[PDB]
Design a protein around this ligand. Structure first.
Ligand SMILES: *[C@@H]1O[C@H](CO)[C@@H](O[C@@H]2O[C@H](CO)[C@@H](O)[C@H](O)[C@H]2NC(C)=O)[C@H](O)[C@H]1NC(C)=O
Ligand SMILES: *[C@@H]1O[C@H](CO)[C@@H](O[C@@H]2O[C@H](CO)[C@@H](O)[C@H](O)[C@H]2NC(C)=O)[C@H](O)[C@H]1NC(C)=O
Ligand SMILES: *[C@@H]1O[C@H](CO)[C@@H](O[C@@H]2O[C@H](CO)[C@@H](O)[C@H](O)[C@H]2NC(C)=O)[C@H](O)[C@H]1NC(C)=O
Ligand SMILES: *[C@@H]1O[C@H](CO)[C@@H](O[C@@H]2O[C@H](CO)[C@@H](O)[C@H](O)[C@H]2NC(C)=O)[C@H](O)[C@H]1NC(C)=O
Lengths: 49, 109
């Protein structure tokens, strides 16, 4: 909707959780689990394809 | 609420008009501009407790910290009523030490 504005990835992810109804408190305390799950899922989908 | 369904940017209003064999839409759109740089932080540590913003974001012009809304810039003094606490800050990454003002303690004097 305009010129691009920089933002750290963690805060964008926090906004995305806040959008769906889960408060941002949850994400900041489980960063490692989310990162590991995301990496495993993307590797699995690559292997499946 | 869907992005770019009618108009480019945030949508406010629309006006219809007729044509010989069609319709013409006038969309009114809101576009931000004239941005700036700021230094952020995820949460604030104070007296062993971690404070998060309610609806906004922590910014710092260089010496002091403030909470502002995402799409506009009006700094406000950090208080204990526009933020909320959840647990102690020892696992959060990006924490910064600072103080949190409250009205009740100065009021009681
Ligand atoms: C929530 O689920 C995650 C993943 O399903 C759990 O994390 C795993 O926990 C097991 C149990 O020891 C470990 O063997 C795995 O290595 C963990 N995975 C990762 C990616 O860390 C987590 O323990 C669950 N938490 C709760 C409270 O149920
Ligand atoms: C960042 O903002 C703070 C808050 O306004 C500034 O601190 C004030 O600066 C003014 C001068 O413009 C003084 O009169 C005030 O006494 C200062 N304190 C407060 C609480 O208002 C600070 O100067 C700003 N930083 C920079 C680099 O401009
Ligand atoms: C943002 O990235 C920078 C770049 O690595 C981080 O700076 C490092 O900070 C650690 C401890 O604070 C130092 O030991 C490193 O030497 C720093 N790196 C450099 C290149 O100077 C910074 O910590 C990151 N910010 C956050 C919140 O993680
Ligand atoms: C924020 O405050 C905490 C608590 O005072 C600081 O943690 C202390 O840091 C010093 C120096 O690294 C250690 O010697 C102490 O053992 C730490 N704990 C306590 C209870 O004093 C912390 O360094 C401050 N700064 C940051 C960036 O967290």
């Amino acid at each position: 909707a305009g010129a691009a504005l920089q933002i750290p990835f963690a805060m964008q992810m926090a906004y995305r959780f806040n959008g769906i109804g889960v408060t941002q408190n949850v994400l900041y305390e489980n960063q490692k689990l989310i990162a590991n799950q995301f990496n495993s899922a993307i590797g699995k989908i690559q292997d499946s394809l | 609420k869907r992005v770019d369904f009618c108009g480019k940017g945030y949508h406010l209003m629309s006006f219809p008009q007729s044509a010989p064999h069609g319709v013409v839409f006038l969309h009114v759109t809101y576009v931000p501009a004239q941005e700036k740089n700021f230094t952020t932080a995820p949460a604030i540590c104070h007296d062993g407790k971690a404070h998060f913003p309610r609806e906004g974001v922590f910014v710092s012009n260089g010496t002091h910290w403030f909470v502002t809304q995402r799409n506009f810039y009006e700094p406000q003094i950090i208080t204990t009523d526009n933020t909320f606490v959840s647990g102690n800050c020892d696992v959060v990454i990006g924490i910064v030490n600072n103080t949190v003002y409250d009205p009740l303690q100065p009021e009681l004097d």
